[PDB]
């Protein structure tokens, strides 16, 4: 996971935040934020690493990355909450929606599809 000192995605690019007081820095860091704020940074890092245009979020590739970040969050929640049936359904559905996205990407753009699998560590399995 991103270090806790990491600045929030909103305040990371505001000018002069590197010189503010240490109290202000930790107040604007991931430590003092909820779990969703760290997930945004995770998605950002994956988008920059894998996607050619990080700004385009409507591409089939950005949607796969965004869904994979959600999938990982559900797996972490389900690790603590084992009998949460509502979230278990959301995980399995999300996994099935990423398989459909990956199938469409494999059919359209193979070169980019391979990069998604490498960066996100997803193994594409053919259905039974």
């Amino acid at each position: 996971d991103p270090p806790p000192s990491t600045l929030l995605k909103d305040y990371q690019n505001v000018p002069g935040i590197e010189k503010v007081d240490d109290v202000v820095k930790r107040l604007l860091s991931l430590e003092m934020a909820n779990k969703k704020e760290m997930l945004k940074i995770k998605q950002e890092q994956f988008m920059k690493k894998i996607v050619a245009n990080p700004e385009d979020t409507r591409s089939l590739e950005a949607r796969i990355i965004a869904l994979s970040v959600k999938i990982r969050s559900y797996e972490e929640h389900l690790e603590k909450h084992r009998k949460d049936k509502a979230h278990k359904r959301y995980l399995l559905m999300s996994i099935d929606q990423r398989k459909k996205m990956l199938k469409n990407l494999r059919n359209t753009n193979y070169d980019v599809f391979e990069k998604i699998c490498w960066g996100l560590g997803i193994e594409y399995t053919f259905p039974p």
Binding site: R26, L27, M32, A33, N34, K35
Partner: protein, 122 residues
């Protein structure tokens, strides 16, 4: 994120109240909280008799602690407050001022529902 600790303290003299307040703030700081402000709401009669730590309290000192803490700190602080015998009631809520009120245009009138039943002649 930003929280508010509504701390009802036992009816004590100023030196003991000061010690309790300092002790509670020190506990928040030990758990990584950045305490922002301390407000004294005054000593008043409790709305109902509260029994805490084998003592029946009819009066208490109402205080507010504005602080920023990590989400994990809240649970730990709640446990610490339970063990403090000088605290009658202690509750941590998400600070109300963080929640922003959406602008309201006003009350929109809803017309009487129509076409509930067919217009056949009964």
């Amino acid at each position: 994120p930003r929280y508010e600790l509504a701390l009802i303290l036992k009816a004590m003299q100023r030196p003991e109240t000061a010690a309790t307040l300092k002790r509670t703030i020190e506990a928040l700081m030990d758990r990584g909280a950045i305490v922002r402000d301390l407000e004294n709401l005054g000593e008043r009669a409790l709305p109902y008799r509260i029994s805490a730590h084998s003592q029946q309290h009819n009066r208490g000192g109402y205080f507010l602690v504005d602080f920023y803490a990590p989400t994990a700190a809240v649970e730990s602080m709640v446990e610490h407050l339970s063990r403090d015998i000088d605290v009658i009631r202690g509750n941590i809520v998400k600070h109300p001022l963080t929640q922003e009120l959406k602008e309201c245009e006003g009350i929109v009138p809803v017309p009487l529902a129509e076409k509930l039943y067919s217009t056949k002649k009964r």
